[PDB]
Chain A
């Protein structure tokens, strides 16, 4: 999942 890491990584 690592949903929260990916969410940080793709916010602009």
Chain B
């Protein structure tokens, strides 16, 4: 009865994730392991390769920004399908997205990453980790912490069905600053956490302490974002104007 409703919730969340996110983890791992009738991705490992495929660091930084705009839009559409979300105070919907969208971007980016690099252009490109590491300060310091995160996170072996619920739980955090109505958010989160617990027991029966492991990952995600926003601050204080997308400006305004 109640277990049936938590599976229906699980499944609705997966359906919405499929509709909201055109590049899933299933498809990225097929590309990354080369088990696809598609041509292998174009590898970018320097200027030579980058060129075939402002200064180089900034052209890359600006590519990450443009892709982040689209990602925020897909994550918004996804958040809108989480039952109860559209009925929340609209100021609290805004706050949940502002403080949570980066945590989701880097959770999902991990689907596209291995120890050697990351898929770009909807899986048509692969940009190597050593290449990104070679970018000058502060740009060459952005992704290294995320590879450290991803390699460990990816060895938990979550699938799209697992991620859909993990993501939903993070978005409905009752502890973001400035929330007006904390309670209805915690009530949705609590039901989502129960759904996650059952999903992991059913989909990963033999994975030791997966639930507690994942809850620690949510905490690790906040640190990753704290540091990420420190670098953005430094860039804002000390670099030329990047002409930010107005959508990203609004989000960066409050966490700076």
Contacts and interface: CB of A to CB of B under 8 A. Distances in A.
Interface of A: 1-6, 8-10
Contacts of A8: 72-73, 76-77, 247
Nearest to B75: A8
Contacts of A6: 90, 94
A9 B250 contact: no
Contact of B80 (A1, A3, A9): A9
Contacts of A1: 250
Counting contact residues on chain B (CB < 8 A from A), the size range is: 10 to 19
A9 B250 CA distance: 14
B29 to A, nearest CB: 29
Contacts, number: 31
Contacts of B73: 8
A2 B251 CA distance: 8
Contacts of A4: 246-247, 250
B129 interface: no
Contacts of B77: 8
Contacts of B250: 1-5
A12 B170 CA distance: 24
Interface in B66-97: 72-73, 76-77, 80, 86, 90, 93-94, 97
B246 A5 contact: no
Contacts of A2: 94, 98, 250
A7 B155 CA distance: 38
A8 B93 CA distance: 11
A1 B98 CA distance: 13
